[PDB]
Amino acid sequence: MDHVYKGQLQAYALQHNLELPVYANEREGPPHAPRFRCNVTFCGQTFQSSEFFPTLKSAEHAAAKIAVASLT
């Protein structure tokens, strides 16, 4: 999985002059069944996917993907 979403959101906020973005980190699930649910708060909006990623950063990248898409 790539990690360009963060670079885009950061540039978007700065370019548009908006309060810095905030990410949320959640980890819960058995050893062989770990789930990382990360939420992204932007412009007073928390976007989240209906699917759980097997990795932490994976959640952040996907989180921004839906977030940046909402803005445009």
Dmax over Cα atoms in the chain, in whole Å? 42
5-16 vs 56-71: helix axis angle to the nearest 10? 40
Q: Which of 62, 61, 64 is nearest to 21 (CA)?
A: 64
- Distance CA(11)–CA(20), nearest Å, equals 10
Counted domains in the chain: 1
Domain that holds residue 34: 1-72
Residue 44 belongs to a domain with what CATH number? 3.30.160.20
Q: 47 near 28, Cβ under 8 Å?
A: no
Rounded to 10 degrees, the C-alpha dihedral 67/59/6/15 comes to: 20
Q: State which approach was used to obtain the coordinates.
A: NMR
For 9-49, the DSSP string reads: HHHHHHHHT----EE---B-S-TTS--B---EEETTEEE--
The rounded Cα 69 to chain-centroid distance in angstroms is 12
What phi and psi, each to the nearest 5 degrees, are found at residue 40? -120, 120
